[PDB]
Ligand binder design. Structure first.
Ligand SMILES: *C/C=C1/C(=C/C2=NC(=C\c3[nH]c(/C=C4\NC(=O)C(C=C)=C4C)c(C)c3CCC(=O)O)/C(CCC(=O)O)=C2C)NC(=O)C1C
Ligand SMILES: *C/C=C1/C(=C/C2=NC(=C\c3[nH]c(/C=C4\NC(=O)C(C=C)=C4C)c(C)c3CCC(=O)O)/C(CCC(=O)O)=C2C)NC(=O)C1C
Lengths: 488, 488
């Protein structure tokens, strides 16, 4: 695996686990040990090979009975402070996937998992905005789980990631407002992150423990998709080492059954969280996901309500004026309140009126012509104007994205909304002087090169028009075409 | 074509047109007459065959120049009061589809199309609810276009149609609140109705004029998809004759780029609308579609806002009470305000509390068990309970549909919403004594048998849970699981 084939890496079947625990794979109904981690002996105090030997021979009739009764769904069953025949005490993660029972053993903590979680969930459930929930969560998770850095990664439309909040040790460099490309988290990883709520890396520079056998008789590997001990891609491992990150923990933020983003915790020293703390963090993750979902819904409603109110106000004015074109010339800048834009313009009766960051005066008739061509009396929008009009590249720094609203059924009059190149709007709060030590596969696996690659990928492009933007533009079209008809 | 193969009828290529006009098909660039209607001669005053003869030879160099310049999109170009070489005056519908130019001739009216339309659109654009827009539109269209009956057909989720408003002559029978099955308008018709804004039938018992040739050299038929003179299925023709309907006009209501339903006008006598009146009706259709869309959006917002307000109120109460289970037992009936239901129930700590039309007390533990099984801590909903629990058939008249909201992360407590069998809720304002004269293919093509077939198809089923219903239920889940956590 290298930078050429890391996008198709089968990370779900690595045939290795992390040192902080040991793994035993069994048949569908926990009779026979088919696979075991090389370190199974070292931790459980067993000698020789465990494969072929029966479940009750290796663990003990006592424990095997508890595990069978528990497996009653692909969601792993957590079972703390379980006792082996020996007398050693382990925290046990038990799950079943592809008709194979997987049992993960951890040296066992003793704290209240629901107790920690309730404290944390109480402090976020009164948040009245996405921004308030996001900003407090990094701060809160850092204080509670004592990680050196906590980021929230939010996925863009194109799969790119933005760092939307950060709590960190003062000495560490900030990634706040920094973007990373979609390739930095390939599709197969995003699929696993949708299936596993949270994901641990105890030691990025630790020695991986192989699973025996890696491939069985039938030629199948062991699918560690739902196994918390699953080993990390050496590509990501090298990325964390280059950043000075030794340990990580990530929580999946699931909103409307989609991967919205990750809460990602970085530590500069090796770090294992005990099962009870992981349970608490996972439950915090669920409640964070649920509350962000409701807040996302409330904001959409408020945005659309505000647009409806603005349009009602405008329709009430339109009735009292005789000349609608006069009212539009005076009013058009006020429509910038409806949809986030860096500039708005009115093209009415082959005349141009601008406000904010619009293309130059001479460029407008070409655009207007183009809009009349493809619009077909519907809202038209692009985040990449130069891809539609190559000569539009020249003014991308001012207007890289456009949304056109037809304001007349009869004539080709348009209300145009403009967005600057997304690179212009960067409020990046990082250090450009900060250099990173690289490994075998070069400086590609550094936040500096990642950010540079993203910047290249969004050249001459604006912030994409959201679904909310297009809903409001459609409601505005119907309102403006509606009164344009009344005034004819 | 008969009741066995009428669902796959190729209505777009019938090889016939209606008598109230004549049709000439030409090559992609209007050089050569490839096809013509048999009645082309009778109306235009030409002798013999027109096929093979050039465009300029049959129409005249004067007219052919105007038609070419006009065809500058698959949307037909309307051109009233055009003059032939002869001196006769025609209204001309010109369109191009599958690289074939189709020209439709009508004996030409003289009224203002934009004038009529503006009067009508003014009277609907101040409607503040869907119900107000719907009720006034049938009344308005009847008064303006003088049709004997005007219905609005609204398509259900399953493709079935409901008659949601009606203006009619007092002597005629009412179809208000009556449903018809999805098969009464097959998929290929719904596809055409999405492509053609409005659709005329001048005379259901008129003689269809054939197109010559029906099939050309290459073996292709003439696609009359966008032709207003296209002839109707003999199946539908027989349906209208059995109802005593001689003429029809239908307008497509397009909402969020989907076929929402039809404005359908029935006349007991033959009836042609002139091109200028059709243009007006088509523009009224567009504005009706646009205003219903905005009103649909406003109602969804209001519904979701109201739910958010109710939940805030409930969360404010939950803070002041100590015992949440006590509050739920006292309050649960109030959640019936959030989602339209005929009954609501609380299943908390293996205890049942009912309100309205719920299943019997003894049936609840079975349901509760089933819900805990399939729910997996997400909102679960069916409109057909007996399909999931066969023994639930017994109480379908009281509860045929259920939506279950999990109110706890930890225990299997549920808030259950119930809907009666959809047949129970019928506010049908029609005449069951009214019998219909049938034709060759029997009593299937009567509103009485259509309604009977629909009733059979929705037996043991409730009104489906809308997207709005499920959004609110999800927000309620997050609110109730949220405070259940705080109180543990
Ligand atoms: C060519 C393939 C590459 C690649 C693969 C890869 N990434 C994985 C996980 C992953 N990658 C990131 C990226 C970042 N984290 C940061 O903090 C920053 C910058 C500050 C970046 C750019 C992250 C956050 C993650 C975690 C994903 C998660 O835990 O859900 C993985 C899977 C790792 C695993 O096995 O758990 C793979 C494979 N990364 C590359 O950069 C490239 C080019
Ligand atoms: C087996 C096929 C059948 C069928 C085919 C068919 N229906 C078509 C159009 C159409 N059908 C209805 C149905 C009704 N109109 C009413 O007023 C009532 C009851 C009061 C009913 C049940 C309607 C309204 C329409 C008009 C559709 C439109 O104009 O968009 C067509 C196409 C007609 C055409 O060529 O324009 C076909 C084919 N109808 C059957 O009942 C059955 C079984």
């Amino acid at each position: 695996v290298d930078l050429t084939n890391c996008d198709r890496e089968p990370i779900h079947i690595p045939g290795y686990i992390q040192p902080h625990g040991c793994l035993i794979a069994c048949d569908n109904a926990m009779r026979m040990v088919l696979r075991h981690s090389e370190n199974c002996g070292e931790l459980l105090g067993l000698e020789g090979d465990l494969n072929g030997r029966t479940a009750e021979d290796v663990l003990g009739k006592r424990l095997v009975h508890d595990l069978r009764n528990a497996l009653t769904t692909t969601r792993p069953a957590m079972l703390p402070a379980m006792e082996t025949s020996d007398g050693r005490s382990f925290d046990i993660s038990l799950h079943r996937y592809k008709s194979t029972t997987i049992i993960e053993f951890e040296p066992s903590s003793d704290t209240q998992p629901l107790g920690t979680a309730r404290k944390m969930v109480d402090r976020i459930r009164e948040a009245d905005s996405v921004e308030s929930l996001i900003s407090r969560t990094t701060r809160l998770v850092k204080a509670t789980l004592g990680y050196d850095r906590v980021l929230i990664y939010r996925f863009e439309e194109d799969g790119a990631g933005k760092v939307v909040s950060e709590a960190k040790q003062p000495e560490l460099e900030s990634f706040l407002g920094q973007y990373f490309p979609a390739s930095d988290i390939p599709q197969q990883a995003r699929a696993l992150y949708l299936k596993n709520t949270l994901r641990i890396i105890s030691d990025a520079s630790g020695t991986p423990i192989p699973v025996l056998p890696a491939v069985d008789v039938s030629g199948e590997p062991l699918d560690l998709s739902y196994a918390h001990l699953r080993n990390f891609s050496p590509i990501h491992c090298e990325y964390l080492r280059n950043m000075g990150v030794a340990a990580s923990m990530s929580i999946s933020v699931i909103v409307d059954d989609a991967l919205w983003g990750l809460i990602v915790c970085h530590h500069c020293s090796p770090r294992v969280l005990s099962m009870p703390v992981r349970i608490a963090a996972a439950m915090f993750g669920e409640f964070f996901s649920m509350f962000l979902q409701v807040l996302k819904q409330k904001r959409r409603l408020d945005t659309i309500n505000h647009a409806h109110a603005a349009l009602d106000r405008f329709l009430r004015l339109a009735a009292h004026r005789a000349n609608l074109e006069e009212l539009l010339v005076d009013s058009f800048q006020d429509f910038a309140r409806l949809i986030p834009c860096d500039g708005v313009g009115l093209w009415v009766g082959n005349n141009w009126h601008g406000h904010g960051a619009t293309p130059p005066h001479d460029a407008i008739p070409r655009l207007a012509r183009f809009v009349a061509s493809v619009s077909e009396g519907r809202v038209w929008a692009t985040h990449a104007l130069s891809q539609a009009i190559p000569e539009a590249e020249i003014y991308a720094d001012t207007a890289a994205g456009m949304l056109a609203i037809p304001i007349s059924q009869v004539k080709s009059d348009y209300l145009l909304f403009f967005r600057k190149e997304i690179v212009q709007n960067l409020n990046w709060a990082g250090n450009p002087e900060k250099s990173y030590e690289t490994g075998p596969m070069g400086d590609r696996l550094t936040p500096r090169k990642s950010f540079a690659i993203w910047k290249e990928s969004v050249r001459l492009q604006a912030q994409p028009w959201s679904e909310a933007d297009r809903e409001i533009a459609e409601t505005a079209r119907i309102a403006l075409v509606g009164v344009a008809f009344h005034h004819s």
